Amino acid sequence: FRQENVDDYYDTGEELGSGQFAVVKKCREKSTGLQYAAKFIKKRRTKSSRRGVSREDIEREVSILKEIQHPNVITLHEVYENKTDVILILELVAGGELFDFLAEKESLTEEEATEFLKQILNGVYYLHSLQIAHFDLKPENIMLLDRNVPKPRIKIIDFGLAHKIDFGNEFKNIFGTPEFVAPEIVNYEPLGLEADMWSIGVITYILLSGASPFLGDTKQETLANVSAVNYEFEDEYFSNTSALAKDFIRRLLVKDPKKRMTIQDSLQHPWIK
Secondary structure (H helix, E strand, O other), X not given: OEOOOHHHHEEEEEEEEEOOOEEEXXXXXXXXXXXXXXXXXXXXXXXXXXXXXXXXXXXXXXXXXXXXXXXXXXXXXXXXXXXXXXXXXXXXXXXXXXHHHHOOOOOOOHHHHXXXXXXXXXXXXXXHHOOEEOOOOOHHHEEEOOOOOOOOOEEEOOOXXXXXXXXXXXXXXXXXXXXXXXXXXXXXXXXXXXXXXXXXXXXXXHHHHOOOOOOOOOHHHHHHHHHHOOOOOOOOOXXXXXXXXXXXXXXXXXXXXXXXXXXXXXXXXXXXX
């Protein structure tokens, strides 16, 4: 990573958002005048510390980002590091959240939505081809490059929990928002590409109905619902949803990961064609 001072080449600006471990600010590259999204990740000081992110976890997120290159995935521009932080100069998005964009339009044809879901599936497809499990697929991580265009492109913007599946030993923890994680995760079981697919199933469900399939009033209720895979298509929301759509969701939200559709099967699915 570049050991120089970010402030020497970029002019940080307004804060765009915060996370338990990071804070992304909008910056302007001095020599080009181009805008970027600088993500500040505070380093872990001690192995016993519960604060910050271990340089290994940072290493992992940087390598992944450095490897990927797809229209539906954020791109990494530069990486700076100082005494306390590791700054990732990331591509800057302007369209906002996908779900904020859709939730501003009138009715959204079941097909008009599939066009967006198709984009997501691609990005995931790309990632999975390189054997990369995103592990943090959720609305908040799905924005739009530009919202003032004929066919706005979606971008998977975060890669913190992203893991490269290596033959041999595996990981077990690494889980994100309860509302979107898969049962394998909750029960701390062997993880794979299946988790991402479960996530996709949840996205599509919310995408079409506007309701979460496992969102409890409290983190514990949710995890409980997820663990029990007790979702349902209540006629109050899924009354104007095709049979194929529900089938598509059913094949994704299944407890046994081996029986759960894969990114390829989902693209071959008749609801996507």
